[PDB]
Amino acid sequence: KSLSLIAAHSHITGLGLDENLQPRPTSEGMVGQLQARRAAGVILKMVQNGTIAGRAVLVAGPPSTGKTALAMGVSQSLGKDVPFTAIAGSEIFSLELSKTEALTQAFRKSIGIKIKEETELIEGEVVEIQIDRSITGGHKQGKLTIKTTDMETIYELGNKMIDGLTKEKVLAGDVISIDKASGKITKLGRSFARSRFVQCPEGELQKRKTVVHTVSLHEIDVINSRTQGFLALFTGDTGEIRSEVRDQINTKVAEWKEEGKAEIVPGVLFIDEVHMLDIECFSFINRALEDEFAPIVMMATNRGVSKTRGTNYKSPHGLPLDLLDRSIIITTKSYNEQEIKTILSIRAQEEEVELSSDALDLLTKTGVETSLRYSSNLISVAQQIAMKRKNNTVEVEDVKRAYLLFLDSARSVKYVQENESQYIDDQGNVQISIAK
Amino acid sequence: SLIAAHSHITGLGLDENLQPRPTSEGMVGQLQARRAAGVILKMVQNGTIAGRAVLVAGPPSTGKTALAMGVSQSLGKDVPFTAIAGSEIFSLELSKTEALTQAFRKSIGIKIKEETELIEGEVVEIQIDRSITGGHKQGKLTIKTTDMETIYELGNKMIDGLTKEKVLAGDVISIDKASGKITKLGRSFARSRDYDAMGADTRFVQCPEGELQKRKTVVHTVSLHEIDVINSRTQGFLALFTGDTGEIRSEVRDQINTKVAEWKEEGKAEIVPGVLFIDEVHMLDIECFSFINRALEDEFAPIVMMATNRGVSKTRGTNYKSPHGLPLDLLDRSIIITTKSYNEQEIKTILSIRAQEEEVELSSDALDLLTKTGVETSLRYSSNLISVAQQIAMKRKNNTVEVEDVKRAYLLFLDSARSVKYVQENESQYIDDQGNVQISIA
Amino acid sequence: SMPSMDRFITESAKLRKLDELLVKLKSEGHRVLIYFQMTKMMDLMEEYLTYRQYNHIRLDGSSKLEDRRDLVHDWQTNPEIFVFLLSTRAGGLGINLTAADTVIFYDSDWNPTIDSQAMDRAHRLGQTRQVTVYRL
Amino acid sequence: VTRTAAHTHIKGLGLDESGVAKRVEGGFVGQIEAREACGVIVDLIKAKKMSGRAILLAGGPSTGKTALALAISQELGPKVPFCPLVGSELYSVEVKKTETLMENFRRAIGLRIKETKEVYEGEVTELTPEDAENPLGGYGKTISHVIVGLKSAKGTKTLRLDPTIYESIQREKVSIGDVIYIEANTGAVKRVGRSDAYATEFDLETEEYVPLPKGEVHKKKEIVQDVTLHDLDVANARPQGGQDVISMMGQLLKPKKTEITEKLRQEVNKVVAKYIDQGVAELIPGVLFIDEVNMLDIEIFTYLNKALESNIAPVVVLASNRGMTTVRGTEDVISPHGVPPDLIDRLLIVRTLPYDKDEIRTIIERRATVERLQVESSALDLLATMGTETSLRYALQLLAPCGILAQTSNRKEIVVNDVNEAKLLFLDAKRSTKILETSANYL
DNA sequence: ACAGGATGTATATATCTGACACGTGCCTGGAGAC
Numbered sequence A: 001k002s003l004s005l006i007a008a009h010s011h012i013t014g015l016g017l018d019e020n021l022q023p024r025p026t027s028e029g030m031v032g033q034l035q036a037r038r039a040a041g042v043i044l045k046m047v048q049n050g051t052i053a054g055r056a057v058l059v060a061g062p063p064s065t066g067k068t069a070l071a072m073g074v075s076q077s078l079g080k081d082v083p084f085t086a087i088a089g090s091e092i093f094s095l096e097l098s099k100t101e102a103l104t105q106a107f108r109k110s111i112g113i114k115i116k117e118e119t120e121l122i123e124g125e126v127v128e129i130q131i132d133r134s135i136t137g138g139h140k141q142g143k144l145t146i147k148t149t150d151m152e153t154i155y156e157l158g159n160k161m162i163d164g165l166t167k168e169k170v171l172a173g174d175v176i177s178i179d180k181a182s183g184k185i186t187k188l189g190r191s192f193a194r195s196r197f198v199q200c201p202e203g204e205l206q207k208r209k210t211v212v213h214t215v216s217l218h219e220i221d222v223i224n225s226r227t228q229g230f231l232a233l234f235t236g237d238t239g240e241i242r243s244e245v246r247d248q249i250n251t252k253v254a255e256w257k258e259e260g261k262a263e264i265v266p267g268v269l270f271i272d273e274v275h276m277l278d279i280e281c282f283s284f285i286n287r288a289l290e291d292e293f294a295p296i297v298m299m300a301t302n303r304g305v306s307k308t309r310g311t312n313y314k315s316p317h318g319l320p321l322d323l324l325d326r327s328i329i330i331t332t333k334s335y336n337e338q339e340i341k342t343i344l345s346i347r348a349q350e351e352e353v354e355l356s357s358d359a360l361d362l363l364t365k366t367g368v369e370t371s372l373r374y375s376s377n378l379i380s381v382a383q384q385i386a387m388k389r390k391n392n393t394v395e396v397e398d399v400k401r402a403y404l405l406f407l408d409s410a411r412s413v414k415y416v417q418e419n420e421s422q423y424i425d426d427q428g429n430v431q432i433s434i435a436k
Numbered sequence B: 001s002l003i004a005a006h007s008h009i010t011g012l013g014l015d016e017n018l019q020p021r022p023t024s025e026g027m028v029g030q031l032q033a034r035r036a037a038g039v040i041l042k043m044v045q046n047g048t049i050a051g052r053a054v055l056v057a058g059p060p061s062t063g064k065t066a067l068a069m070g071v072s073q074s075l076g077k078d079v080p081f082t083a084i085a086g087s088e089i090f091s092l093e094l095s096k097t098e099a100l101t102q103a104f105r106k107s108i109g110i111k112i113k114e115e116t117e118l119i120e121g122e123v124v125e126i127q128i129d130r131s132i133t134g135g136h137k138q139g140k141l142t143i144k145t146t147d148m149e150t151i152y153e154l155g156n157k158m159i160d161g162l163t164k165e166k167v168l169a170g171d172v173i174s175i176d177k178a179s180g181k182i183t184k185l186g187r188s189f190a191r192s193r194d195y196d197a198m199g200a201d202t203r204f205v206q207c208p209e210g211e212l213q214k215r216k217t218v219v220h221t222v223s224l225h226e227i228d229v230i231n232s233r234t235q236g237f238l239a240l241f242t243g244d245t246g247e248i249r250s251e252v253r254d255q256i257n258t259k260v261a262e263w264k265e266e267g268k269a270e271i272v273p274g275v276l277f278i279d280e281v282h283m284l285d286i287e288c289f290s291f292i293n294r295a296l297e298d299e300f301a302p303i304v305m306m307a308t309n310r311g312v313s314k315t316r317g318t319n320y321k322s323p324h325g326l327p328l329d330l331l332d333r334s335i336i337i338t339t340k341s342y343n344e345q346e347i348k349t350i351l352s353i354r355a356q357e358e359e360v361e362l363s364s365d366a367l368d369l370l371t372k373t374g375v376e377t378s379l380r381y382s383s384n385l386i387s388v389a390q391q392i393a394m395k396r397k398n399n400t401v402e403v404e405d406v407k408r409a410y411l412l413f414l415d416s417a418r419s420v421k422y423v424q425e426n427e428s429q430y431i432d433d434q435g436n437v438q439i440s441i442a
Numbered sequence C: 001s002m003p004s005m006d007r008f009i010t011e012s013a014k015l016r017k018l019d020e021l022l023v024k025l026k027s028e029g030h031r032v033l034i035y036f037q038m039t040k041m042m043d044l045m046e047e048y049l050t051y052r053q054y055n056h057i058r059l060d061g062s063s064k065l066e067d068r069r070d071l072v073h074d075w076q077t078n079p080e081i082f083v084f085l086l087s088t089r090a091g092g093l094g095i096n097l098t099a100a101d102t103v104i105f106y107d108s109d110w111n112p113t114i115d116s117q118a119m120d121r122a123h124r125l126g127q128t129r130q131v132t133v134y135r136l
Numbered sequence D: 001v002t003r004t005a006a007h008t009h010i011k012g013l014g015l016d017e018s019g020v021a022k023r024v025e026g027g028f029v030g031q032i033e034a035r036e037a038c039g040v041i042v043d044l045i046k047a048k049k050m051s052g053r054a055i056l057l058a059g060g061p062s063t064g065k066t067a068l069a070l071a072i073s074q075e076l077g078p079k080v081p082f083c084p085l086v087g088s089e090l091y092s093v094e095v096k097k098t099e100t101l102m103e104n105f106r107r108a109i110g111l112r113i114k115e116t117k118e119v120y121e122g123e124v125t126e127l128t129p130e131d132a133e134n135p136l137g138g139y140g141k142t143i144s145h146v147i148v149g150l151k152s153a154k155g156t157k158t159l160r161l162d163p164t165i166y167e168s169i170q171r172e173k174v175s176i177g178d179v180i181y182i183e184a185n186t187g188a189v190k191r192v193g194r195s196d197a198y199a200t201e202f203d204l205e206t207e208e209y210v211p212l213p214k215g216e217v218h219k220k221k222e223i224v225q226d227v228t229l230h231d232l233d234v235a236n237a238r239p240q241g242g243q244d245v246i247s248m249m250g251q252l253l254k255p256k257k258t259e260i261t262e263k264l265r266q267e268v269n270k271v272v273a274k275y276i277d278q279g280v281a282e283l284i285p286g287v288l289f290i291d292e293v294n295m296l297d298i299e300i301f302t303y304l305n306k307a308l309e310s311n312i313a314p315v316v317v318l319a320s321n322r323g324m325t326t327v328r329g330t331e332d333v334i335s336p337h338g339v340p341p342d343l344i345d346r347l348l349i350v351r352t353l354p355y356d357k358d359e360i361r362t363i364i365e366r367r368a369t370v371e372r373l374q375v376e377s378s379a380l381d382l383l384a385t386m387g388t389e390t391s392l393r394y395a396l397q398l399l400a401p402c403g404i405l406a407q408t409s410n411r412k413e414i415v416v417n418d419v420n421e422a423k424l425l426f427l428d429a430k431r432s433t434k435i436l437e438t439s440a441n442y443l
Numbered sequence E: 001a002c003a004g005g006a007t008g009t010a011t012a013t014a015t016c017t018g019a020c021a022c023g024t025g026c027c028t029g030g031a032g033a034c
């Protein structure tokens, strides 16, 4: 389930909190940032209560200080059957959709409807098939013997069950599941007969299966618009769904909630690098947050007092002040050296890299000197340098070799500035010749 | 098909030692540029190297497009020569890189060997069996020569080709098996009973003798872009003409490259590279140059030729100025041919050749006056004056252009400098850059 | 797309060179003997022969002893037969094959003693033309 | 003989077994530290464990940046997917640039699948349909069943089909005497050709003649397939290959790029993980190579920051040759190599260095001996001094006009006079700029 | 304790017999009516 190689945030399994919303010093792969983790726990409790809609939370701080890690931990701690939509800022500048339409689709993808229903299923092990054919083929009679580990029965088939058993060819010894009302037959595999391989079912042959469905509002909006099929959920060309088909969905959802046939499960919409949105998008968000069917919006940015896109003035965090009036701000701080060492040890443990203590001290020192992400990236390179020398652990000399081979930002800036005649500048001038 | 600007150039005018003659094949002067273009022509004809860029630079009205036309004329048949301008890349249904990829791939030809069978004879009996709605069609054809006689079998397209150009059991036809072409050579039986439902006057040919079926080998050349467009979708052959080939995916191009290498391996096909000529290359974006820098390094790349007439001008899409309007990374991987301006003897020879091309009789004094005004003004103006002076001289009912006709043409039709002077003397009557004009004459 | 005989021919260099001289050998109106070593050396070659619809038969000792009596008779009597397949010792010992001259060795490199009897069955008394031996 | 184009003298990094690089090996000269770093990167790719590791190759023009990426692609082998790219190619007119970037991301993750097929095949012996009782009833087809008799080697089977399979069969235009190939996975039917059991020389439609297929009519065979994730995404977004109406009309309309949703990618990931869990499939991550990365603007960079942090992304290799230039799409942001600092923080920069006279001379030697040319020693020294004076690429590109001028004088050796003549006939950038500055009317 | 000459192995072939299979002619007991 959920195939993945190793992610950059794969070591985080959620927020490290106790029952009183207090952060442990190290829990669930999260180190430090106690106030930000407490605030994110309060926000997670607000999402879990479900009585509050349309609140905007801004996460701001310096780059590479636990901003995306916090949202990753929130999404892990949310659990299943609660929608979580994560989009970047530059994903809404489409060619076939307007920006407000893409924002509306992203807003309505994060509100779910929970429906429980009941059905009758027959699942067992096929013992024997008897099918007799007349010369003219006017009628088909048949008998089906099927069993579980506890029962045994023989059925008499009609014409269309015989036709549906001939199609999707079922032999003896198979384990199949039959839906009576829809006529769908699924081959679960072959039972344990060596002559893929699935154990024989137990208990009753006829069973009641309660399935809990979770459908987003966007799926109902796509389906109820008759100009498009349900294939637009996969192809992606919904193409500016009309406004008047959404009020019918809202009224129907309110009626279903009143009658007790359905429940509303609100979710979280996460916008990463929110500073790349236009001013029209911010003006749309200002009114879209005040709706009753609105999720809780988390936005993250790292800029400070920069130019808002589409305008010609500067604003704090790259956002206009009327949007900042509607938000509560969580601020993250830079990391200490002990937290850098703990984070690097966790990242080395994730990649199953054995480090010496002196190598860990060297990585911590060069992480304080330059960057956390550079020291995180050097571990997997130094591991391959260690496997080149045919030893398991990673020593100091491998880290020094990797530091010599792969540069950082400041050293590259120094090498560029010392030899700027060999590069192409802003005026397009270069000197390719060596001599003269 | 008509008398054009470069219609007098047929080749490059070179020896076997690649030494340019002073006047040969419609080209005069410019010995170094002609020699360099001959070297590039031999480089294309060898066909062993790929992705070389040649830049032709000089002042306007010098002979860059004349040199490219001479190269294309001396290149010979069945070798592709794609000539585009720089402003054709900017399209509404294609991105710039896709249009450049199609322009690159149009200049590489694939020469395919084919085996065919030719059947010529006299038709004895045609039987055609069709269904009630006319969908399924099948039948038998009985054809014969003077010696042999055979009964064949027909398919859908053979029956469709027989229904058109209707054959009437006694016509002499020739069938190509691989091409599927029906050609009616004529009628040989000359039947007596003829009904008045036909109005043709079919010729009397003889019944052919010898073998009924022969074996032949044919050779045709198909460019790479045609193969991509054909293999792209179901009805790509119509898109080869309508231009509705929108952004072919890269998997198609990879599989076509592998198949072309496989055909080269088996001896079925061979690769004939050509020349892509981009005239007025300074009207290109910076992204086009960035694409060209990596597209020149591919295996299937032609010899790219560019021409420009700009000095240190602004590169399009940037905010700085570059030599020839091209960035320095592209200029690093290019080879530059420089053309020089003309003398007065070269201008006189050019005007004499252009007068002989337009079939205009000229006097000595008219040619001398045309040479003097082509030295003072541009060359192209004095070249344009020839046909106008010919019509003016023809109005006076004599087929020889004299000095009075050239003076009348010089009086009636203006120069650039004379028009600039006349505009600057009376600048209130024209609409300025601020949109102000005095229309009243009082 | 179904596996293609041409690509099957051209991916083997020995078969590629074998297909060249066979065309002019058929154009001459000749008789050809080809020797082999493996099963699949003579289990893939008649696919190429039926691709060229050449008149051929296969002889080896895995076949019954009755068939060797009349296969040699049909080879020596009928002139329209073109290709006569063989293993090393199956028909290269005492079999009268004077109706052909061109023996073609696909992989006969095992020992000179075996090959010295191989053309002995063909280059025999009764041959009326020159013998051209092709070793591949 | 063959065709050479700006490369193909490079076969690999030319490293030892312990990672050290020989000076002249694999077609490379010099650049020892960059070659060793690329070898470490190649080992990291072959480890098949990491996701979203990105490096950047920085240096001047004509220093060996794209040659290192091509050497990486040659060292990895053909079984690893390698997707070359140029930064100007992301600006499409059919779909947004974010979708093009994500498509090229998913195009670089391969998959090897051992799948099985159900095949009915043989020569058609009979073709008889049975009609329906009410053909004009509006509901249901004209026919009810079609009896098809197939004969293969040591076998004969009789099949009873629905009209759905017979519609594809008659779309293939199947007659009596043809050899067909029915694939039961999708209902696709291939008409192989006429059987060779009948006469051959009485046809007029250039057919091929096929022997009878061996084995039984019903078969089960294993095929090893190599596909990418983007192939699955495209095949599911625009469905073709079924026998229904929707997949049949999808082959006739004009194809167009569409914004593939995240839900389809999640479902494809679920199905692929299920295939891997049964021991059928196997994941092969690859390399995405984006050359000329300065052509990108700030929006693609900001989406690249998000896309590198996903749990499926391949190894990304970038290249740039700018010192400290403004990022495109901005006005005030001045950053090294035209790459914004938040993306620079996620990279690992590999520096490349310029060459010397000796390296230029031996590079010219290697390029001359690749192109089947014979150069004298004095001409070699003249070309080396020319390369140090003007450019390496100008000296490399002057070899073929020198060879042509030598060949046109009935000679094999390249001498000094050919190099002087090629200097006269063809110019370089500095002399062209010198002519441009001292000229009358914008030459 | 090592070298040298014997068999052992492998991985294809090849020819050839052995102990099973399948296919056919033809009568008497099974089937039907009572």
Ligand SMILES: Nc1ncnc2c1ncn2[C@@H]1O[C@H](COP(=O)(O)OP(=O)(O)O)[C@@H](O)[C@H]1O
Pocket: A008, A009, A029, A030, A031, A032, A033, A062, A063, A064, A065, A066, A067, A068, A069, A070, A302, A343, A372, A373
């Ligand atoms: N408190 C933390 N616990 C674990 N890992 C962290 C923590 N803070 C930062 N990191 C790691 O640092 C790296 C950069 O942090 P991230 O939040 O992704 O960037 P930014 O802060 O710019 O959004 C990530 O790989 C993340 O795993």
Ligand SMILES: Nc1ncnc2c1ncn2[C@@H]1O[C@H](COP(=O)(O)OP(=O)(O)O)[C@@H](O)[C@H]1O
Pocket: B005, B006, B009, B026, B027, B028, B029, B030, B058, B059, B060, B061, B062, B063, B064, B065, B066, B307, B309, B350
């Ligand atoms: N050497 C030549 N031989 C024949 N015609 C020439 C020659 N040089 C110039 N011309 C004429 O000059 C015109 C070409 O000028 P132009 O196309 O502007 O050159 P460029 O585009 O390189 O400046 C054509 O009309 C051509 O007939």
Ligand SMILES: Nc1ncnc2c1ncn2[C@@H]1O[C@H](COP(=O)(O)OP(=O)(O)O)[C@@H](O)[C@H]1O
Pocket: D006, D007, D027, D028, D029, D030, D031, D060, D061, D062, D063, D064, D065, D066, D067, D068, D321, D363
């Ligand atoms: N170490 C080397 N050995 C051989 N040839 C080289 C070497 N470095 C560069 N080259 C050649 O010089 C040219 C450099 O171009 P390339 O590396 O593709 O991009 P850039 O021009 O940005 O360096 C290539 O054609 C390559 O063949």
